Amino acid sequence: GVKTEQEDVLAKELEDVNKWGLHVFRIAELSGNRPLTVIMHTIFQERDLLKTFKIPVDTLITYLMTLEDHYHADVAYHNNIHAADVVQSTHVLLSTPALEAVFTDLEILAAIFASAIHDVDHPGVSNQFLINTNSELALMYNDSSVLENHHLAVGFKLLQEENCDIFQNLTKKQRQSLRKMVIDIVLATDMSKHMNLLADLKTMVETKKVTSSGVLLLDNYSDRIQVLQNMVHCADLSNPTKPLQLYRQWTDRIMEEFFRQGDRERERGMEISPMCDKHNASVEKSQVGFIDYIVHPLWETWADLVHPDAQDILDTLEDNREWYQST
């Protein structure tokens, strides 16, 4: 009834689950490529979610393993490790001092569950690739948020497998609310929604209230959900805010995925996508452009929302930006 030594090494690593920069790749190794399962399990226990929602533990484990298995091991970036990272990063963002006591258990469950399923069954190519190849998925979703609609459908559909319904003891009311929030959050991970989300984040920063001091004031669904949406979007785009040794690993993986799509595009004479082209790519330049135009405006705005909880994260982003720039 005692951990093996590998399990103990895993356990000591997981003591960092509440911190930006967990070594998720080491956890992936220690766990036998189960970073999503062990990290979700640790977080659910940590937040008392099993008791609060009467989730039987074997059901939670069975579902997590099933969820994890529907991420593609042969996809370099959009895989279970990325899902685990986004989960644990959303987990840390949820605990930010400026959001203390703001969100309900159900909203907390929604953000974490949405994080876990948000890229499930990703084929490792983009929406545009899927649309252009006349793929079955693109036709099912009428070319609209193709992957993101698919991630949701898979994530929910998997609750129907044997002993997988982790929401079996929630009331209809809890389930309908949970489901809508999860759907709103995941659909918001589509980059084509990025400009609007950021616009609304800013507007809320311009017009933000604080009550009892410190903590933010969110008094309608629109505001509560848009903050959750931006939170997970932030976790999804958190690679450049992480210590450089992690960030570079993510960048290697995303570039491996992009070039591979570039290869497949040429294996069919398709026009080559924005910097998916091996040979004609500057990884350093693309990262700088990515940070200046997308990641920094997002996180800078987030940092303002929860000032100054996010100062260390923003500083790390800027350091990494200068680092890449120095090339």
Q: Catalytic residue, from 23, 41, 78, 279: name it.
A: 78
Scanning residues 224 to 283, which ones bind Zn ion (CB under 5 A)?
Answer: 236
**Which residue, among 251, 241, 222, has the nearest Cα to 300 in the 3D structure?**
241
Q: Which stretch of DSSP H or E encloses residue 117?
A: helix 105-117
Phi, psi for residue 298 in degrees, rounded to 5: -65, -60
Residue (53 or 299) nearer to Zn ion, CB: 299
Least distance in Å: CB of 154 to Zn ion? Answer: 12
Query: Is 290 assigned to a binding site?
Result: yes
C-alpha–C-alpha distance, residues 261 and 135, integer Å = 15
Query: Is 287 assigned to a binding site?
Result: yes
E-strand stretches of the chain: none
Residue (236 or 309) nearer to Zn ion, CB: 236
Query: Is 296 assigned to a binding site?
Result: no
121 three-class SS = coil
Least distance in Å: CB of 119 to Zn ion? Answer: 4
Query: Is 194 assigned to a binding site?
Result: no
Scanning residues 117 to 136, which ones bind Zn ion (CB under 5 A)?
Answer: 119
Residue (62 or 89) nearer to Zn ion, CB: 89
Q: Is 78 a catalytic residue?
A: yes
Q: Assess contact for 208 and 305: CB atoms under 8 A.
A: yes
**Residue in the structure block whose two tokens are 């690593």:** 13
Scanning residues 175 to 214, which ones bind Zn ion (CB under 5 A)?
Answer: 189
**Which residue, among 236, 325, 239, 317, has the nearest Cα to 282 in the 3D structure?**
325
Residue (25 or 323) nearer to Zn ion, CB: 25
Greatest C-alpha distance within the chain: 61
Cα Rg of the chain (Å, integer): 20
Least distance in Å: CB of 39 to Zn ion? Answer: 15
Query: Is 151 assigned to a binding site?
Result: no
Scanning residues 68 to 127, which ones bind Zn ion (CB under 5 A)?
Answer: 119
- Which residues define the annotated binding site for Mg(2+)? 119
Q: Which residues are near Zn ion by CB under 5 A?
A: 119, 189, 236
Give the catalytic positions in this structure.
78
- Which residues define the annotated binding site for Mn(2+)? 119
